[PDB]
Amino acid sequence: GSHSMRYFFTSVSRPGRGEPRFIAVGYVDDTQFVRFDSDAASQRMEPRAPWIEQEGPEYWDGETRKVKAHSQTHRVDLGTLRGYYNQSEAGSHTVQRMYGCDVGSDWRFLRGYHQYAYDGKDYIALKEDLRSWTAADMAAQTTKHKWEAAHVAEQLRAYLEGTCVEWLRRYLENGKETLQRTDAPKTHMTHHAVSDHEATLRCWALSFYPAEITLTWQRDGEDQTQDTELVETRPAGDGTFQKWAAVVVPSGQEQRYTCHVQHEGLPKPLTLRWE
């Protein structure tokens, strides 16, 4: 169905221990394809997907150029933000930026995003209209003012509505066997006694792609979402994902419980039962 391209940028100040650390990563859906680390030897944007390795020198030179320009602007930002929040020079601080675009199953533009965080909290974010800003505190209002006077929203709309979607289309085609795939989950439920009178029931989904999945437990048809332990979707390391959900139930009641699995690669939602 739908696809996205997203770039993620993290800068961390490290006072007395060097210039800030800067890491950038690009994803198509749940597939990483590029990275930059300011502390690596190469000082180059590097491939992280086989299908991106096709791109030629103009590409890598261009992407190294732009990524370093992102890094030097975040380095400035760290200094600026200290000023805006009257913080000390001695503390370590974090800036995060993410931007990208989503397209539907017809590869037409759905929406674009460009959001920024300081110390793990929303700071400023481009609204869905791609023409206005949501500033989450007074400092961020200063940023809004400067970005409005500088017509930054208009520059980002152009990239997000055009370039972003064009390259995302290019990548989806070039990486089509990797990127235009669905791997349905392989499912099963495990049962282990925790004592004389209780059992843990764990519903597993394995080897799936993309990562979006819903796992839910029902007791006699009723969702058990309050008593369900749901782990974060995790990478297997091979391009697929894993997830599980668990409830601890009274021994003898297993047959009341069913696990329900929802994923794009399932022809229909699955119900696993203990009978």
Binding site: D77, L81, Y123, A150, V152, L156, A158, T163, W167
Partner: peptide, 10 residues
Amino acid sequence: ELAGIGIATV
């Protein structure tokens, strides 16, 4: 591709 325009200092 990364953005070439619109990435501004705060």
